[PDB]
PDB file of C-alpha atoms in Angstrom:
ATOM      1  CA  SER U   4      -2.667  27.465  21.486  1.00 52.33           C
ATOM      2  CA  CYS U   5      -2.352  25.154  18.517  1.00 53.37           C
ATOM      3  CA  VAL U   6      -1.956  21.832  20.422  1.00 53.26           C
ATOM      4  CA  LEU U   7      -3.644  19.121  22.318  1.00 54.21           C
ATOM      5  CA  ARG U   8      -2.380  16.723  24.981  1.00 48.25           C
ATOM      6  CA  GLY U   9      -4.003  13.830  26.651  1.00 49.29           C
ATOM      7  CA  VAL U  10      -4.900  10.195  26.523  1.00 53.25           C
ATOM      8  CA  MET U  11      -7.328   8.693  23.986  1.00 48.06           C
ATOM      9  CA  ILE U  12      -8.758   5.136  24.396  1.00 47.13           C
ATOM     10  CA  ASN U  13     -11.484   3.177  22.480  1.00 46.94           C
ATOM     11  CA  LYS U  14     -14.211   2.731  25.187  1.00 46.84           C
ATOM     12  CA  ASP U  15     -17.542   3.882  26.295  1.00 45.94           C
ATOM     13  CA  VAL U  16     -19.401   4.140  29.606  1.00 47.15           C
ATOM     14  CA  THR U  17     -20.763   0.736  30.725  1.00 45.87           C
ATOM     15  CA  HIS U  18     -24.328   2.210  31.253  1.00 46.07           C
ATOM     16  CA  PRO U  19     -26.078   4.836  29.061  1.00 44.76           C
ATOM     17  CA  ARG U  20     -27.445   6.900  32.035  1.00 41.23           C
ATOM     18  CA  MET U  21     -23.795   7.601  32.993  1.00 38.10           C
ATOM     19  CA  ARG U  22     -22.136  11.048  32.416  1.00 39.89           C
ATOM     20  CA  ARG U  23     -20.008  11.286  29.378  1.00 42.04           C
ATOM     21  CA  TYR U  24     -18.692  14.840  30.165  1.00 44.37           C
ATOM     22  CA  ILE U  25     -17.002  15.705  33.550  1.00 41.48           C
ATOM     23  CA  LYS U  26     -14.971  18.701  34.440  1.00 41.43           C
ATOM     24  CA  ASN U  27     -12.256  18.236  37.042  1.00 40.34           C
ATOM     25  CA  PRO U  28     -13.073  14.552  37.377  1.00 42.32           C
ATOM     26  CA  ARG U  29     -11.987  12.563  40.534  1.00 40.01           C
ATOM     27  CA  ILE U  30     -10.612   9.384  38.985  1.00 40.17           C
ATOM     28  CA  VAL U  31     -10.184   6.049  40.699  1.00 42.91           C
ATOM     29  CA  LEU U  32      -8.142   3.326  38.885  1.00 42.75           C
ATOM     30  CA  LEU U  33      -8.401  -0.460  39.511  1.00 40.52           C
ATOM     31  CA  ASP U  34      -6.868  -3.657  38.083  1.00 39.85           C
ATOM     32  CA  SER U  35      -9.293  -5.978  39.938  1.00 39.19           C
ATOM     33  CA  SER U  36     -12.846  -7.227  39.200  1.00 38.70           C
ATOM     34  CA  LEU U  37     -16.192  -5.924  40.185  1.00 41.06           C
ATOM     35  CA  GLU U  38     -18.015  -9.134  39.822  1.00 39.25           C
ATOM     36  CA  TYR U  39     -18.526 -11.941  42.286  1.00 35.13           C
ATOM     37  CA  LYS U  40     -15.228 -13.486  43.458  1.00 36.02           C
ATOM     38  CA  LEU U  60     -26.770 -14.800  45.522  1.00 37.09           C
ATOM     39  CA  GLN U  61     -27.511 -13.350  48.862  1.00 36.76           C
ATOM     40  CA  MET U  62     -24.067 -13.493  50.210  1.00 34.97           C
ATOM     41  CA  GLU U  63     -22.644 -12.615  46.731  1.00 34.84           C
ATOM     42  CA  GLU U  64     -24.865  -9.690  46.383  1.00 37.07           C
ATOM     43  CA  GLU U  65     -23.700  -8.352  49.863  1.00 34.74           C
ATOM     44  CA  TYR U  66     -20.125  -8.890  48.577  1.00 35.23           C
ATOM     45  CA  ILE U  67     -20.728  -6.608  45.652  1.00 33.40           C
ATOM     46  CA  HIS U  68     -22.516  -3.989  47.727  1.00 33.22           C
ATOM     47  CA  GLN U  69     -19.498  -3.698  49.929  1.00 32.74           C
ATOM     48  CA  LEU U  70     -17.165  -3.455  47.121  1.00 33.50           C
ATOM     49  CA  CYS U  71     -18.986  -0.611  45.735  1.00 34.34           C
ATOM     50  CA  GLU U  72     -19.518   1.052  49.139  1.00 33.64           C
ATOM     51  CA  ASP U  73     -15.689   1.182  49.428  1.00 32.63           C
ATOM     52  CA  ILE U  74     -15.271   2.848  46.076  1.00 33.62           C
ATOM     53  CA  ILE U  75     -18.222   5.260  46.711  1.00 31.81           C
ATOM     54  CA  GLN U  76     -16.835   6.438  50.202  1.00 31.66           C
ATOM     55  CA  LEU U  77     -14.133   8.138  48.029  1.00 32.31           C
ATOM     56  CA  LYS U  78     -16.682  10.163  46.170  1.00 32.81           C
ATOM     57  CA  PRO U  79     -15.019   9.544  42.712  1.00 28.73           C
ATOM     58  CA  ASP U  80     -16.693  10.855  39.407  1.00 29.87           C
ATOM     59  CA  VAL U  81     -14.988   7.941  37.437  1.00 28.12           C
ATOM     60  CA  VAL U  82     -14.166   4.437  38.194  1.00 26.75           C
ATOM     61  CA  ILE U  83     -12.017   2.558  35.624  1.00 29.48           C
ATOM     62  CA  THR U  84     -10.932  -1.116  35.802  1.00 29.32           C
ATOM     63  CA  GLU U  85      -8.896  -3.539  33.734  1.00 29.17           C
ATOM     64  CA  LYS U  86     -11.516  -6.190  34.495  1.00 29.64           C
ATOM     65  CA  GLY U  87     -15.283  -6.562  34.313  1.00 31.56           C
ATOM     66  CA  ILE U  88     -18.189  -4.868  36.262  1.00 27.08           C
ATOM     67  CA  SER U  89     -21.330  -6.777  36.942  1.00 28.47           C
ATOM     68  CA  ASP U  90     -24.830  -5.257  36.146  1.00 28.78           C
ATOM     69  CA  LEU U  91     -25.354  -4.877  39.978  1.00 31.42           C
ATOM     70  CA  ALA U  92     -22.056  -3.049  40.632  1.00 32.47           C
ATOM     71  CA  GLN U  93     -22.931  -0.839  37.652  1.00 34.60           C
ATOM     72  CA  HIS U  94     -26.257  -0.087  39.257  1.00 33.01           C
ATOM     73  CA  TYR U  95     -24.785   1.055  42.589  1.00 33.01           C
ATOM     74  CA  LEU U  96     -22.110   3.050  40.957  1.00 33.24           C
ATOM     75  CA  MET U  97     -24.908   4.491  38.695  1.00 34.03           C
ATOM     76  CA  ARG U  98     -26.911   5.508  41.851  1.00 33.09           C
ATOM     77  CA  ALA U  99     -23.766   7.200  43.299  1.00 34.66           C
ATOM     78  CA  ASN U 100     -23.628   9.267  40.093  1.00 34.39           C
ATOM     79  CA  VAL U 101     -20.455   7.486  39.168  1.00 29.73           C
ATOM     80  CA  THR U 102     -19.330   6.901  35.502  1.00 29.15           C
ATOM     81  CA  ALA U 103     -17.845   3.462  35.015  1.00 29.14           C
ATOM     82  CA  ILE U 104     -15.536   1.963  32.315  1.00 24.07           C
ATOM     83  CA  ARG U 105     -14.638  -1.637  32.099  1.00 22.62           C
ATOM     84  CA  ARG U 106     -12.038  -3.908  30.398  1.00 19.79           C
ATOM     85  CA  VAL U 107      -9.457  -1.234  29.791  1.00 17.93           C
ATOM     86  CA  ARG U 108      -5.915  -2.606  28.625  1.00 12.60           C
ATOM     87  CA  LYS U 109      -3.387  -2.692  31.297  1.00  9.68           C
ATOM     88  CA  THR U 110      -1.200  -0.150  29.180  1.00  8.35           C
ATOM     89  CA  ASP U 111      -4.087   2.315  28.731  1.00  8.37           C
ATOM     90  CA  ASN U 112      -4.745   2.122  32.480  1.00 10.05           C
ATOM     91  CA  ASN U 113      -1.089   3.071  33.153  1.00  8.31           C
ATOM     92  CA  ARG U 114      -1.419   5.907  30.550  1.00  8.55           C
ATOM     93  CA  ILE U 115      -4.376   7.164  32.396  1.00 12.08           C
ATOM     94  CA  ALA U 116      -2.548   6.932  35.761  1.00 12.51           C
ATOM     95  CA  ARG U 117       0.301   9.048  34.596  1.00  9.97           C
ATOM     96  CA  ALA U 118      -2.109  11.684  33.079  1.00 11.71           C
ATOM     97  CA  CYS U 119      -4.198  12.155  36.115  1.00 12.56           C
ATOM     98  CA  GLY U 120      -1.960  11.082  39.028  1.00  8.39           C
ATOM     99  CA  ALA U 121      -4.121   8.232  40.080  1.00  9.19           C
ATOM    100  CA  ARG U 122      -2.682   4.985  41.530  1.00  5.44           C
ATOM    101  CA  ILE U 123      -3.933   1.781  40.080  1.00  5.14           C
ATOM    102  CA  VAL U 124      -5.257  -0.255  43.153  1.00  3.68           C
ATOM    103  CA  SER U 125      -6.230  -3.932  43.597  1.00  2.00           C
ATOM    104  CA  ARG U 126      -8.387  -4.184  46.648  1.00  2.00           C
ATOM    105  CA  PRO U 127     -10.951  -1.400  46.915  1.00  2.00           C
ATOM    106  CA  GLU U 128     -11.042  -1.617  50.728  1.00  3.15           C
ATOM    107  CA  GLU U 129      -7.360  -0.443  50.742  1.00  2.00           C
ATOM    108  CA  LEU U 130      -8.221   2.675  48.658  1.00  2.00           C
ATOM    109  CA  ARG U 131      -6.801   6.073  50.177  1.00  2.00           C
ATOM    110  CA  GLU U 132      -7.649   9.556  49.314  1.00  2.00           C
ATOM    111  CA  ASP U 133      -3.993   9.738  47.915  1.00  3.25           C
ATOM    112  CA  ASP U 134      -4.840   7.129  45.157  1.00  4.37           C
ATOM    113  CA  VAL U 135      -7.597   9.484  43.623  1.00  2.00           C
ATOM    114  CA  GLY U 136      -6.473  11.079  40.462  1.00  2.00           C
ATOM    115  CA  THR U 137      -7.165  14.916  40.317  1.00  2.00           C
ATOM    116  CA  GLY U 138      -4.532  15.872  37.678  1.00  2.00           C
ATOM    117  CA  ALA U 139      -6.791  15.847  34.603  1.00  2.00           C
ATOM    118  CA  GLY U 140      -9.203  18.599  34.131  1.00  2.00           C
ATOM    119  CA  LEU U 141     -11.364  16.953  31.493  1.00  2.00           C
ATOM    120  CA  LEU U 142     -13.067  13.554  30.854  1.00  2.00           C
ATOM    121  CA  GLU U 143     -14.997  13.672  27.640  1.00  2.00           C
ATOM    122  CA  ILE U 144     -16.489  10.605  25.879  1.00  2.00           C
ATOM    123  CA  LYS U 145     -17.761  11.270  22.231  1.00  2.00           C
ATOM    124  CA  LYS U 146     -18.539   9.379  19.076  1.00  2.00           C
ATOM    125  CA  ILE U 147     -16.088   9.441  16.103  1.00  2.00           C
ATOM    126  CA  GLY U 148     -17.191   7.399  13.205  1.00  2.00           C
ATOM    127  CA  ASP U 149     -18.961   4.187  14.379  1.00  2.00           C
ATOM    128  CA  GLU U 150     -17.120   4.026  17.815  1.00  2.00           C
ATOM    129  CA  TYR U 151     -16.920   5.925  21.128  1.00  2.00           C
ATOM    130  CA  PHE U 152     -13.708   7.306  22.269  1.00  2.00           C
ATOM    131  CA  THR U 153     -12.786   8.389  25.930  1.00  2.00           C
ATOM    132  CA  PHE U 154     -10.541  11.441  26.199  1.00  2.00           C
ATOM    133  CA  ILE U 155      -8.796  12.473  29.354  1.00  2.00           C
ATOM    134  CA  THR U 156      -7.241  16.072  28.671  1.00  2.00           C
ATOM    135  CA  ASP U 157      -6.245  19.104  30.345  1.00  2.00           C
ATOM    136  CA  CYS U 158      -3.209  17.704  32.246  1.00  2.00           C
ATOM    137  CA  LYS U 159      -1.755  19.876  35.020  1.00  2.00           C
ATOM    138  CA  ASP U 160       1.673  18.388  34.351  1.00  2.00           C
ATOM    139  CA  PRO U 161       1.886  19.115  30.617  1.00  2.00           C
ATOM    140  CA  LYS U 162       4.650  16.482  30.658  1.00  2.00           C
ATOM    141  CA  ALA U 163       2.315  13.864  31.989  1.00  2.00           C
ATOM    142  CA  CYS U 164       0.376  13.535  28.672  1.00  2.00           C
ATOM    143  CA  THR U 165       1.301  12.909  25.063  1.00  2.00           C
ATOM    144  CA  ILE U 166       0.476  15.140  22.028  1.00  2.00           C
ATOM    145  CA  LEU U 167      -2.742  14.297  20.342  1.00  2.00           C
ATOM    146  CA  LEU U 168      -2.628  17.302  17.971  1.00  2.00           C
ATOM    147  CA  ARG U 169       0.209  19.731  16.705  1.00  2.00           C
ATOM    148  CA  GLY U 170      -0.359  22.474  14.164  1.00  3.67           C
TER     149      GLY U 170
ATOM    150  CA  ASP D   3     -13.007  28.424  15.489  1.00  3.34           C
ATOM    151  CA  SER D   4      -9.215  28.061  16.311  1.00  2.10           C
ATOM    152  CA  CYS D   5      -7.291  24.801  16.336  1.00  2.02           C
ATOM    153  CA  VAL D   6      -9.930  22.667  14.862  1.00  5.77           C
ATOM    154  CA  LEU D   7      -9.209  19.278  13.096  1.00 10.01           C
ATOM    155  CA  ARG D   8     -11.957  18.262  10.526  1.00 11.68           C
ATOM    156  CA  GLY D   9     -11.976  15.037   8.739  1.00 11.28           C
ATOM    157  CA  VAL D  10     -12.299  11.241   9.221  1.00  6.42           C
ATOM    158  CA  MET D  11     -10.328   9.029  11.627  1.00  2.87           C
ATOM    159  CA  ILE D  12     -10.431   5.267  11.214  1.00  2.00           C
ATOM    160  CA  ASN D  13      -8.651   2.530  13.188  1.00  2.66           C
ATOM    161  CA  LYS D  14      -6.366   1.362  10.488  1.00  2.00           C
ATOM    162  CA  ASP D  15      -2.647   1.139   9.492  1.00  3.30           C
ATOM    163  CA  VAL D  16      -1.114   0.745   6.005  1.00  2.42           C
ATOM    164  CA  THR D  17      -0.667  -2.785   4.686  1.00  2.00           C
ATOM    165  CA  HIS D  18       3.220  -2.475   4.507  1.00  2.00           C
ATOM    166  CA  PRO D  19       5.181  -0.563   7.054  1.00  2.00           C
ATOM    167  CA  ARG D  20       7.404   1.181   4.296  1.00  2.00           C
ATOM    168  CA  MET D  21       4.389   2.716   2.277  1.00  2.00           C
ATOM    169  CA  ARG D  22       4.187   6.484   2.478  1.00  2.00           C
ATOM    170  CA  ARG D  23       2.314   7.176   5.770  1.00  2.00           C
ATOM    171  CA  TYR D  24       2.079  11.109   5.358  1.00  2.00           C
ATOM    172  CA  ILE D  25       0.733  12.462   2.007  1.00  2.00           C
ATOM    173  CA  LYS D  26      -0.158  16.185   1.115  1.00  2.00           C
ATOM    174  CA  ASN D  27      -3.048  16.523  -1.250  1.00  2.19           C
ATOM    175  CA  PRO D  28      -3.385  12.631  -1.864  1.00  3.09           C
ATOM    176  CA  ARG D  29      -5.219  11.427  -4.877  1.00  4.92           C
ATOM    177  CA  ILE D  30      -7.661   8.672  -3.428  1.00  4.35           C
ATOM    178  CA  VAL D  31      -9.302   5.724  -5.013  1.00  7.52           C
ATOM    179  CA  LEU D  32     -11.860   3.753  -2.941  1.00 10.42           C
ATOM    180  CA  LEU D  33     -13.143   0.381  -3.681  1.00  8.15           C
ATOM    181  CA  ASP D  34     -15.566  -2.230  -2.018  1.00  2.00           C
ATOM    182  CA  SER D  35     -14.098  -5.104  -4.195  1.00  2.00           C
ATOM    183  CA  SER D  36     -11.391  -7.611  -3.515  1.00  2.00           C
ATOM    184  CA  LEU D  37      -7.801  -7.165  -4.665  1.00  2.00           C
ATOM    185  CA  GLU D  38      -7.136 -10.876  -4.129  1.00  2.00           C
ATOM    186  CA  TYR D  39      -7.414 -13.936  -6.491  1.00  2.00           C
ATOM    187  CA  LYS D  40     -10.004 -16.836  -5.761  1.00  2.00           C
ATOM    188  CA  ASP D  55      -0.205 -27.503 -12.904  1.00  2.00           C
ATOM    189  CA  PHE D  56       1.320 -25.178 -10.205  1.00  2.00           C
ATOM    190  CA  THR D  57       2.891 -22.956 -12.676  1.00  2.00           C
ATOM    191  CA  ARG D  58      -0.353 -22.451 -14.634  1.00  2.00           C
ATOM    192  CA  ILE D  59      -2.101 -21.444 -11.405  1.00  2.00           C
ATOM    193  CA  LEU D  60       0.546 -18.917 -10.636  1.00  2.00           C
ATOM    194  CA  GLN D  61       0.322 -17.628 -14.140  1.00  2.00           C
ATOM    195  CA  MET D  62      -3.431 -17.081 -14.020  1.00  2.00           C
ATOM    196  CA  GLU D  63      -3.320 -15.580 -10.562  1.00  2.00           C
ATOM    197  CA  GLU D  64      -0.612 -13.187 -11.947  1.00  2.00           C
ATOM    198  CA  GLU D  65      -2.300 -12.163 -15.129  1.00  2.00           C
ATOM    199  CA  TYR D  66      -5.486 -11.441 -13.056  1.00  2.00           C
ATOM    200  CA  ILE D  67      -3.861  -9.327 -10.369  1.00  2.00           C
ATOM    201  CA  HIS D  68      -1.654  -7.552 -12.813  1.00  2.00           C
ATOM    202  CA  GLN D  69      -4.542  -6.352 -14.855  1.00  2.00           C
ATOM    203  CA  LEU D  70      -6.417  -5.285 -11.792  1.00  2.00           C
ATOM    204  CA  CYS D  71      -3.569  -3.214 -10.421  1.00  2.00           C
ATOM    205  CA  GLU D  72      -2.993  -1.820 -13.875  1.00  2.00           C
ATOM    206  CA  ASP D  73      -6.528  -0.531 -14.128  1.00  2.00           C
ATOM    207  CA  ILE D  74      -5.938   1.230 -10.802  1.00  2.00           C
ATOM    208  CA  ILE D  75      -2.467   2.465 -11.438  1.00  2.00           C
ATOM    209  CA  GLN D  76      -3.472   4.214 -14.682  1.00  2.00           C
ATOM    210  CA  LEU D  77      -5.295   6.852 -12.480  1.00  2.00           C
ATOM    211  CA  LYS D  78      -2.013   7.703 -10.621  1.00  2.00           C
ATOM    212  CA  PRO D  79      -3.597   7.515  -7.259  1.00  2.00           C
ATOM    213  CA  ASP D  80      -1.534   8.095  -4.081  1.00  2.00           C
ATOM    214  CA  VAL D  81      -3.777   5.884  -1.952  1.00  2.00           C
ATOM    215  CA  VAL D  82      -5.907   2.905  -2.607  1.00  2.00           C
ATOM    216  CA  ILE D  83      -8.393   1.790  -0.039  1.00  2.00           C
ATOM    217  CA  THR D  84     -10.888  -1.157  -0.226  1.00  2.00           C
ATOM    218  CA  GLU D  85     -13.484  -2.836   1.998  1.00  2.00           C
ATOM    219  CA  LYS D  86     -12.012  -6.283   1.164  1.00  2.00           C
ATOM    220  CA  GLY D  87      -8.602  -7.933   1.018  1.00  2.00           C
ATOM    221  CA  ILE D  88      -5.408  -6.972  -0.712  1.00  2.00           C
ATOM    222  CA  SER D  89      -3.031  -9.946  -1.613  1.00  2.00           C
ATOM    223  CA  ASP D  90       0.849 -10.058  -1.312  1.00  2.00           C
ATOM    224  CA  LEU D  91       1.254  -9.961  -5.122  1.00  2.00           C
ATOM    225  CA  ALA D  92      -1.333  -6.870  -5.480  1.00  2.00           C
ATOM    226  CA  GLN D  93       0.640  -5.172  -2.463  1.00  2.00           C
ATOM    227  CA  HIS D  94       3.737  -5.734  -4.452  1.00  2.00           C
ATOM    228  CA  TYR D  95       2.435  -4.299  -7.730  1.00  2.00           C
ATOM    229  CA  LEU D  96       0.910  -1.215  -5.951  1.00  2.00           C
ATOM    230  CA  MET D  97       4.117  -0.456  -4.140  1.00  2.00           C
ATOM    231  CA  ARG D  98       6.167  -0.635  -7.334  1.00  2.00           C
ATOM    232  CA  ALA D  99       3.887   2.233  -8.288  1.00  2.00           C
ATOM    233  CA  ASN D 100       4.360   4.174  -5.089  1.00  2.00           C
ATOM    234  CA  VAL D 101       0.862   3.594  -3.873  1.00  2.00           C
ATOM    235  CA  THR D 102      -0.144   3.349  -0.105  1.00  2.00           C
ATOM    236  CA  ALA D 103      -2.759   0.640   0.509  1.00  2.00           C
ATOM    237  CA  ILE D 104      -5.377   0.186   3.247  1.00  2.00           C
ATOM    238  CA  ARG D 105      -7.369  -3.025   3.474  1.00  2.00           C
ATOM    239  CA  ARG D 106     -10.468  -4.204   5.131  1.00  2.00           C
ATOM    240  CA  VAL D 107     -12.052  -0.804   5.967  1.00  2.00           C
ATOM    241  CA  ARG D 108     -15.774  -0.944   7.153  1.00  2.00           C
ATOM    242  CA  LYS D 109     -18.488   0.150   4.754  1.00  2.00           C
ATOM    243  CA  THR D 110     -19.521   2.881   7.036  1.00  2.00           C
ATOM    244  CA  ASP D 111     -15.887   4.391   7.215  1.00  2.00           C
ATOM    245  CA  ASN D 112     -15.402   4.007   3.372  1.00  2.00           C
ATOM    246  CA  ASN D 113     -18.580   6.029   2.932  1.00  2.00           C
ATOM    247  CA  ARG D 114     -17.272   8.799   5.299  1.00  2.00           C
ATOM    248  CA  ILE D 115     -13.987   8.942   3.323  1.00  2.00           C
ATOM    249  CA  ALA D 116     -15.970   9.333   0.153  1.00  2.00           C
ATOM    250  CA  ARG D 117     -17.797  12.294   1.317  1.00  2.00           C
ATOM    251  CA  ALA D 118     -14.675  13.791   2.875  1.00  2.00           C
ATOM    252  CA  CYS D 119     -12.556  13.454  -0.273  1.00  2.00           C
ATOM    253  CA  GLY D 120     -15.049  13.370  -2.917  1.00  2.00           C
ATOM    254  CA  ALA D 121     -14.141  10.015  -4.429  1.00  2.92           C
ATOM    255  CA  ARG D 122     -16.598   7.379  -5.592  1.00  3.78           C
ATOM    256  CA  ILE D 123     -16.378   3.909  -4.149  1.00  3.07           C
ATOM    257  CA  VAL D 124     -16.198   1.639  -7.129  1.00  5.51           C
ATOM    258  CA  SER D 125     -16.802  -2.093  -7.479  1.00  3.21           C
ATOM    259  CA  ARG D 126     -15.054  -2.706 -10.800  1.00  4.08           C
ATOM    260  CA  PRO D 127     -11.514  -1.087 -11.328  1.00  4.27           C
ATOM    261  CA  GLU D 128     -12.023  -1.088 -15.140  1.00  5.68           C
ATOM    262  CA  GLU D 129     -14.726   1.414 -14.810  1.00  7.31           C
ATOM    263  CA  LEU D 130     -12.354   3.965 -13.142  1.00  6.07           C
ATOM    264  CA  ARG D 131     -12.113   7.452 -14.431  1.00  2.00           C
ATOM    265  CA  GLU D 132     -10.690  10.760 -13.151  1.00  2.00           C
ATOM    266  CA  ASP D 133     -14.184  11.807 -11.811  1.00  2.00           C
ATOM    267  CA  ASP D 134     -13.910   8.806  -9.418  1.00  2.00           C
ATOM    268  CA  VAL D 135     -10.625  10.127  -7.801  1.00  2.42           C
ATOM    269  CA  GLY D 136     -10.835  12.042  -4.621  1.00  2.00           C
ATOM    270  CA  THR D 137      -8.904  15.227  -4.490  1.00  7.20           C
ATOM    271  CA  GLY D 138     -10.975  16.903  -1.830  1.00  4.21           C
ATOM    272  CA  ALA D 139      -8.974  16.055   1.313  1.00  4.37           C
ATOM    273  CA  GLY D 140      -5.589  17.907   1.716  1.00  4.26           C
ATOM    274  CA  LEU D 141      -3.975  15.449   3.950  1.00  2.00           C
ATOM    275  CA  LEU D 142      -3.701  11.654   4.802  1.00  2.51           C
ATOM    276  CA  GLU D 143      -1.482  10.786   7.842  1.00  4.69           C
ATOM    277  CA  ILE D 144      -1.168   7.704   9.953  1.00  6.18           C
ATOM    278  CA  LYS D 145      -0.517   8.190  13.675  1.00  4.93           C
ATOM    279  CA  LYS D 146      -0.031   5.895  16.528  1.00  3.75           C
ATOM    280  CA  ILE D 147      -2.196   6.643  19.469  1.00  2.00           C
ATOM    281  CA  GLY D 148      -1.608   4.509  22.504  1.00  4.23           C
ATOM    282  CA  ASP D 149      -1.322   0.858  21.151  1.00  5.15           C
ATOM    283  CA  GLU D 150      -3.232   1.616  17.982  1.00  7.53           C
ATOM    284  CA  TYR D 151      -2.560   3.059  14.615  1.00  9.05           C
ATOM    285  CA  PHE D 152      -5.164   5.584  13.256  1.00  8.48           C
ATOM    286  CA  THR D 153      -5.481   7.038   9.715  1.00 10.55           C
ATOM    287  CA  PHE D 154      -6.447  10.658   9.685  1.00 13.83           C
ATOM    288  CA  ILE D 155      -7.820  11.945   6.405  1.00 13.19           C
ATOM    289  CA  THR D 156      -8.323  15.833   6.981  1.00 14.77           C
ATOM    290  CA  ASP D 157      -8.410  19.414   5.634  1.00 14.59           C
ATOM    291  CA  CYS D 158     -11.525  18.939   3.665  1.00 14.73           C
ATOM    292  CA  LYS D 159     -11.795  21.379   0.661  1.00 14.07           C
ATOM    293  CA  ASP D 160     -15.740  21.436   0.942  1.00 11.26           C
ATOM    294  CA  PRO D 161     -16.391  23.217   4.271  1.00 12.57           C
ATOM    295  CA  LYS D 162     -19.738  21.346   4.708  1.00 11.20           C
ATOM    296  CA  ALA D 163     -18.351  17.801   4.248  1.00 12.28           C
ATOM    297  CA  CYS D 164     -16.459  17.024   7.599  1.00 12.71           C
ATOM    298  CA  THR D 165     -17.178  16.986  11.304  1.00 15.40           C
ATOM    299  CA  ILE D 166     -14.755  17.859  14.155  1.00 17.24           C
ATOM    300  CA  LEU D 167     -12.345  15.198  15.063  1.00 16.92           C
ATOM    301  CA  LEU D 168     -10.167  17.238  17.469  1.00 14.83           C
ATOM    302  CA  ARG D 169     -10.296  20.615  19.138  1.00 15.26           C
ATOM    303  CA  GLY D 170      -7.112  22.381  20.380  1.00 15.89           C
TER     304      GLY D 170
END
């Protein structure tokens, strides 16, 4: 009753058209870049996104950057994206939702998708936006944000 | 409406790890002025006389917490701790204004002007909590029910 568990990080969606409130979100976690690594480069980005999108996630979070083009494709697939997340926060999110941090998108498996967190809500507190991943199925998987 | 936290939350820690980090009904003083100072012995003496008077002006009001938008020097931190005062430096102007509305204090520019009316007694709790890798200061339990927004809902 008088308590709240979950992860809180200082981040916002990369693009304003993205959903900031998602119930039972399917979460994909990466530690790799979604930027070129212009015609052959543009095709590269397309395929990177295609591999993520095949898994029908609601949220894609990476420790690196996301180019304006990758953001666009994910946006078209109704996917909320968050970039430049600290490695420690990414692991906190992995524990909370049961996702597996993956490097190469083409190696993604349905087993890597996190479905253990019931809420993803991004809201403004003061001057900044905070991302909350709450409603953990495994109570133990999340730390306490509020105790009466 | 059940398990609701109202107040202000700012990304800040105290200036010294051993200051009180949990205070019920804190008396709050807010400033937008510097608590820094700008023959070697003569210099030290001048810096000291200046900082001493500054801290004395503040200490006279028996505050539990002193928060400013600018800096707080080691000597100032030393004199405020001798008075059992918890201090927070470099808070943003926007956050400082939110704290003012939450606790009723007036942000003052010149400590010598300080009076009881300037002391914020409106918030019932100040607490610093570590969330993830960051420290956050929670000023909550607003006495005026129309002063604060919802931070967290349980």
